[PDB]
Design a protein around this motif. Structure first.
Motif, short mmCIF file in Angstrom:
data_model
loop_
_atom_site.label_atom_id
_atom_site.label_comp_id
_atom_site.label_asym_id
_atom_site.label_seq_id
_atom_site.Cartn_x
_atom_site.Cartn_y
_atom_site.Cartn_z
N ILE A 4 20.40 -56.09 21.61
CA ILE A 4 20.03 -57.43 21.36
C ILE A 4 20.85 -57.92 19.98
O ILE A 4 21.23 -58.75 19.89
N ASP A 5 20.45 -56.88 19.05
CA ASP A 5 21.21 -56.98 17.58
C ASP A 5 22.66 -57.05 17.72
O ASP A 5 23.34 -57.84 17.11
N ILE A 8 24.40 -60.12 18.87
CA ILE A 8 24.22 -61.28 17.84
C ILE A 8 25.59 -60.87 16.99
O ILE A 8 26.44 -61.74 16.70
N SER A 13 26.77 -64.69 16.34
CA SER A 13 25.41 -65.59 15.83
C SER A 13 24.37 -65.31 17.08
O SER A 13 24.57 -64.87 18.21
N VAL A 14 23.30 -65.88 16.61
CA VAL A 14 22.09 -65.90 17.78
C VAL A 14 22.00 -67.26 18.45
O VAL A 14 21.60 -67.38 19.65
N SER A 15 22.88 -68.39 17.70
CA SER A 15 22.85 -69.56 18.34
C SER A 15 23.83 -69.44 19.59
O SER A 15 23.91 -69.86 20.83
N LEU A 17 24.42 -66.37 20.97
CA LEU A 17 23.98 -65.36 21.94
C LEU A 17 23.04 -66.16 22.99
O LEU A 17 22.91 -65.60 23.90
N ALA A 18 22.01 -67.06 22.28
CA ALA A 18 20.99 -67.75 23.08
C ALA A 18 21.60 -68.42 23.84
O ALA A 18 21.06 -68.83 25.18
N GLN A 25 17.01 -69.67 20.04
CA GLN A 25 17.40 -68.84 18.81
C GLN A 25 16.10 -67.92 18.68
O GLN A 25 16.23 -66.79 18.15
N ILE A 28 15.66 -64.96 21.23
CA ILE A 28 16.33 -63.68 20.62
C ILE A 28 15.75 -62.62 19.51
O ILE A 28 15.97 -61.64 19.81
N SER A 29 15.31 -63.31 18.68
CA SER A 29 14.48 -62.99 17.41
C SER A 29 13.47 -62.15 17.88
O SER A 29 13.19 -60.90 17.25
N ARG A 32 14.77 -58.89 19.86
CA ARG A 32 15.43 -57.88 18.86
C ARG A 32 14.19 -57.24 18.22
O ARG A 32 14.31 -55.73 17.93
#
Length: 65
Positions: A4-5, A8, A13-15, A17-18, A25, A28-29, A32
């Motif tokens: 997951i990391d 990213i 980025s997570v934005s 990725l998501a 966002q 994802i957090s 991870r």
């Protein structure tokens, strides 16, 4: 370090990725920090972590039928 990391890092980025995974966002957090993703999503993350780290998802709980 987890799938997951590294996804990213790969997408930048997570934005990003998501948006690609079709979640927010925060999801994802959670994933991870959880160290795994829900059933049917690791496929996409594993594209981005293809030779970096092997990815794993949960198996279908409710699913359907």
């Amino acid at each position: 370090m987890n799938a997951i990391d590294i996804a990213i890092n790969k997408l930048g980025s997570v934005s990003a990725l998501a948006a690609a995974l079709g979640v927010n966002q925060s999801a994802i957090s959670q994933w991870r920090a959880r160290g795994r993703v829900p059933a049917g999503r690791c496929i996409d993350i594993e594209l981005y972590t293809d030779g970096r780290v092997e990815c794993r998802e949960l198996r279908p709980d409710v699913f359907g039928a």
